[PDB]
Amino acid sequence: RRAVYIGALFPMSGGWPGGQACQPAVEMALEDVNSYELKLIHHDSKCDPGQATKYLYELLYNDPIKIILMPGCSSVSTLVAEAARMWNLIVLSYGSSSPALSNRQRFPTFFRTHPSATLHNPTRVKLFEKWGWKKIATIQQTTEVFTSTLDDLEERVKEAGIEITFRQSFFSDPAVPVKNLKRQDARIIVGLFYETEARKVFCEVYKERLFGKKYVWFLIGWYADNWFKIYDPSINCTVDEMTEAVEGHITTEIVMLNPANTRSISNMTSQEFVEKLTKRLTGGFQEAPLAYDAIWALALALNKTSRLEDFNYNNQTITDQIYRAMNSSSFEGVSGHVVFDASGSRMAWTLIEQLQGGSYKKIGYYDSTKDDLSWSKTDKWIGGSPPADDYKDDD
Amino acid sequence: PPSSPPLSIMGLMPLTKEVAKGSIGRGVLPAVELAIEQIRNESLLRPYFLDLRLYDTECDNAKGLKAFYDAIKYGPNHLMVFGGVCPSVTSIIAESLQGWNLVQLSFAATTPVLADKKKYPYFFRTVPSDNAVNPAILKLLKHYQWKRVGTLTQDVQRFSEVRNDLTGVLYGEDIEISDTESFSNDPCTSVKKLKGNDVRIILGQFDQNMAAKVFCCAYEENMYGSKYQWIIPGWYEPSWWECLRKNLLAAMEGYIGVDFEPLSSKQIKTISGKTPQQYEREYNNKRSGVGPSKFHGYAYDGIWVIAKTLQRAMETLHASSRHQRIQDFNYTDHTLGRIILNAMNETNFFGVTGQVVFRNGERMGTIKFTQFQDSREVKVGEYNAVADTLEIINDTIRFQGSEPPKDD
Ligand SMILES: *[C@@H]1O[C@H](CO)[C@@H](O)[C@H](O)[C@H]1NC(C)=O
């Protein structure tokens, strides 16, 4: 039983604190896979490329040799996947949604169990069509995960005869973009940023009065449920002001846990995985099934390739064999049917929610493959119906 | 001398003939060599010597990161980083500095996000950044009495950050941004919106490829001539333009470009005892198998910043302890990193690029104004950030009308 090491990064804080539930999910999966021996060497990236750079150095320049790298965040995964070719290392992410990571020329040894963020876009388009909007505004924080999602959204809106009439971007301070959205009289707004930046955006939204009956915000649904209620020294807005600014907004997220009560390769049902993970415990709870399945995907790919002690960073041979096994992966995990295609579309469903009276309510689900919008009729709007995308009365 | 200890510096830049940007690294090396030559001849760092080690980034994220990692693993105990030319490579290095207690000095990375001190606390640059054009434009607007402007920005980080910075520069200044327009791949819709809002003075922030599309849309919308003033980035490649060419040229006539000033116009003796003009001639004589680089003066002054920082880092009556701490450095000493950071922060001398001084790691320098006049970019002015003064060159700047355009 030779030891085989995984060099992993877990974000315990930062943009997406996914490591909080994904690290225990990885630990639960390793126990199951082991019972060669798969061993974990891990560090807290804090969802920070600067911090990950120090830990990447320690993983690569210190013994033991690692067969695979496992990063979380899109920014950390982008840095490690770009660099990995220099060490002929396979990179496997459990949390990276960045559409840009689908670029095989730029990331030739990269795999992910997390779907591409492009899956939010057909759902956003379906809702724009449902609600009769042809004019949308966008505000994004400048991490590539968001910029590349917006690049895809621009293509999907153009295809549907919908226009992005105003765009604003920021690196850290959204003050100017939000003021400009207000002055442009933008109505339907898609905001792409991490939870941390979402608080800064919504405090500016409160100050500019860019909320109410006329305004509809579309955000990413994987924030913590209480995201707008959390103390933040970088914001002057109170909890009640924040709560009013976020009222009625729409979110989209990808369904990552199998909704059917079946038993996967691990012999667990989606429901038992949740109790088991809860027994071990939170950021990354919704992504935890992907972390669990990433270990299984690796374990099965290592089994098929089976000379592992001889892996070196200067040799392509073992890398190419593992790549081919990963490429041909096909098994049933807690997240459903696990496979590894370039454009990251193995998941068929998105979950749509609306914030009502400070709490998220499920309003529907969308399957872009079959074009099925499952609607709960649980959405609420001031006056009983959604607003317009602009004034229509100036003859 | 064999008894002369090294003060090792990690030089990171593109050098290879295989990459287009290798010409920058190769182009600044004669400037670097001249500074090192004189510092040693003067024994400014006595009994030590400045040991600059060179590592090729190849202007590539993966190769740049490995060059850095290999410099740490296998090179001598570097005290600081000198370089970073390609913005993406510079960012990867600059954000990670604290992990190895390394202060970095760049002579070529101009992107605005590197000014973020929360993300890049240990990062310094001798070159004025892309945001440095904003206080200069403010002085230009005040000069020609332009109180109403429109903005046209490409929705990309480096441009949106300059535009966001602009609001803060214009605050309390009595200049209105009457219309803010942004585009991703097609400026035509945004140009049409600016025309519809009767904007006359346009502040543009977009790349070289987008500039041709912008001027083509301006031509189609008749947003050029005596009634209009376009103020755009001045860092594009020479003859970047070379719409039918004649129509593009009609729309481009009189546009103002804004960029850093490569060398000081003042005939004053710098820290080296040489005027900027004498340095320029010595630079052209030293370079042999390389084309000139517009960052050469910034690289030259950059070596002087490192030398003056090191000299300051050694100024203590606790001499033997300080020398021992320097000798012992192995990236783990937070105290030495702090001493170096504080010493660099104190920089204040007259360099070949003008007065070399930092404001929160950003260069307080000189901005050059150019105007497009018949397929040639003519220098029309200089803005000095320290003095906050604008000097317009007499008999250079021209307007198609009898008077400069009105803002309305
Ligand atoms: C850096 O230099 C500035 C300008 O002279 C000074 O105000 C500031 O205190 C310095 N920062 C330190 C010493 O940490």
Which three-class secondary structure string do you get for chain B?
CCCCCEEEEEEEECCCCCCCCHHHHHHHHHHHHHHHHHHHHCCCCCCCEEEEEEEECCCCHHHHHHHHHHHHHHCCCCCEEEECCCHHHHHHHHHHHHHHCCEEEECCCCCHHHHCCCCCCCEEECCCCHHHHHHHHHHHHHHCCCCEEEEEEECCHHHHHHHHHHHHHHCCCCCEEEEEEEECCCCHHHHHHHHHCCCCEEEEECCHHHHHHHHHHHHHCCCCCCCCEEEEECCCCCCCCCCCHHHHHHHHCCCEEEEECCCCCCCCCCCCCCCHHHHHHHHHHHCCCCCCCCCHHHHHHHHHHHHHHHHHHCCCCCHHHHHHHHHHCCCCCHHHHHHHHHHHHCCEEEECCEEEEEECCEECCEEEEEEECCCCEEEEEEEECCCCEEEECCCCCCCCCCCCCCCC
Same domain (yes/no): A315, A389: no
CATH number for domain B129-265+366-408, candidates 3.40.50.2300, 3.40.50.2000, 3.20.20.70, 3.10.20.600: 3.40.50.2300
| B157 closest CB neighbour out of A50, A171, A184 | A171
**Is B179 at the interface with chain A, CB within 8 A?**
no
Same domain (yes/no): A200, A160: yes
| A167 closest CB neighbour out of B116, B155, B157 | B155
Size of interface A-B (CB pairs under 8 A): 81
Count the Cβ atoms, other than its own, within 10 Å of residue B80: 25
The answer to whether residues B383 and B389 touch, using CB atoms and an 8 Å cutoff, is yes
To one decimal place, what's the resolution in Å?
Answer: 2.5
Question: What's the domain count of chain A?
Answer: 2
Residue with tokens 């667990």: A268
Point out which residues pair with B391 in neighbouring strands: B382
Same domain (yes/no): A31, A152: no
**Is B61 at the interface with chain A, CB within 8 A?**
yes
Q: B1-128+266-365: what fold?
A: Rossmann fold (3.40.50)
**Domain of A141?**
116-259+349-395
Ligand 1 centre distance from Cα of residue A196 (Å): 30
Nearest CA to ligand 1 atom 12: B342
Q: Note the residue count of chain A.
A: 395
Same domain (yes/no): A234, A160: yes
Tell me the pairing of strands A188-192 and A216-220. Answer: parallel
What span, in angstroms and rounded, lies between the C-alpha atoms of A306 and A303? 5
Residue A70 maps to which CATH number?
3.40.50.2300
What span, in angstroms and rounded, lies between the C-alpha atoms of B401 and B408? 15
The phi-psi region of residue B75 (left if phi > 0; otherwise alpha if psi is between -120 and 50; otherwise beta) is: beta
Same domain (yes/no): A12, A84: yes
Q: CATH 3.40.50.2300 residue ranges in chain B?
A: 1-128+266-365, 129-265+366-408
Same domain (yes/no): A175, A270: no
What technique was this entry resolved by? X-ray
Same domain (yes/no): A224, A321: no
What span, in angstroms and rounded, lies between the C-alpha atoms of B340 and B308? 10
What span, in angstroms and rounded, lies between the C-alpha atoms of B256 and B373? 10
Residue with tokens 């701490």: B325
Contacts of B81 (CB under 8 A, 6+ apart): B9, B10, B12, B93, B97, B102, B103, B104, B105
**Is A60 at the interface with chain B, CB within 8 A?**
yes
Same domain (yes/no): A78, A225: no
User: Within 13 A of B313's CA, how many CA atoms are on the CB side?
Assistant: 29
Within 123-142 of B, beta carbons closer than 8 Å to A belong to none
Same domain (yes/no): A222, A366: yes
Burial of residue B351 (CB within 10 Å: 0-12, 13-18, 19+) is: buried
A85 vs B182: CB contact, 8 Å cut-off?
Answer: no
What span, in angstroms and rounded, lies between the C-alpha atoms of B102 and B84? 14
Of A130, A157, A153, the C-alpha closest to A374 is: A130
What span, in angstroms and rounded, lies between the C-alpha atoms of A119 and A220? 12
